[PDB]
Point group: C2
Chain length 169, copies 2
Amino acid sequence: NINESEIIERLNSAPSVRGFFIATVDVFNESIDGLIQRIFRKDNFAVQSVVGPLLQDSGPLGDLSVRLKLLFGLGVLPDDIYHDIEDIIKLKNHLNSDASDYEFTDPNILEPIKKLHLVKKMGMVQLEVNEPDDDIDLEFYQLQLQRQQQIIKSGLSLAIVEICNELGK
Amino acid sequence: NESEIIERLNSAPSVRGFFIATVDVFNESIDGLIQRIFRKDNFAVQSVVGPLLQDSGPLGDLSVRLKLLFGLGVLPDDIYHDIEDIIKLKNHLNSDASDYEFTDPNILEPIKKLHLVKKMGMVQLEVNEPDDDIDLEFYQLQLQRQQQIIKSGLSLAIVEICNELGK
């Protein structure tokens, strides 16, 4: 349970969508930084004297996105993982450029998340929406809509958790 | 391979000329290394790898791309430093309005400092003069002889380095 419950606890904690996505790229960031470090000899102080700078923020390999391209290019990440992470990073940036807030139930969020290889792998679960003159009562109309969101977000969180597990092997 | 590059180092008319050809050589040898160490197939991969490697890309640079090859464990310490070291030097030269000569100290000392020139075996020195004048003829001709062997020595180092880069 450990590692997983930690990070998914962390994702729950995220109050908002923008909050959420920030936390997940952060999560990935740490997760591939554990990898980058497993491939550049953890140790020689001589060798870290090249590598450290290479990988610092200001360095040519400072940035998460480039760090992905490398690992992918280098035959270390699988296609499907390379794309998913990239796709999520790119989504976070969009939202972070966007003045309007969105919800996990919204087309321009939900649809991105469907395209993602890993939700295609794990399949997905969604609560049926509000329809006029269907059984749903309007006093609950709202709490139910929150509840759709928490379902979607949780599926996503499981995807993310899976992804970090692969990155860990 | 081994030879059409001894011709390159040869046809170089000058210290500056020499070092420019020699990092060109380093540049293309290491290119083909870097290239084989990366995935080199699928469009999607060549779609990511293409631009990563190209010049404006993060791995555009030679020296960046040596740095990474070293950190991956691919290049031995000795050869990383030597290439790096010879690069510092070509650049030095390329920023310096003064022409030097292989027997000049700012030039020969750092070349004697490389791991291969110590290791393959081009080791010596030579007193600075000439004694007076009525002597500059003779002395010119010894220098001329030394330059050409120090030139040759480094050339051995360089072509060796390259034959490792491919191996």
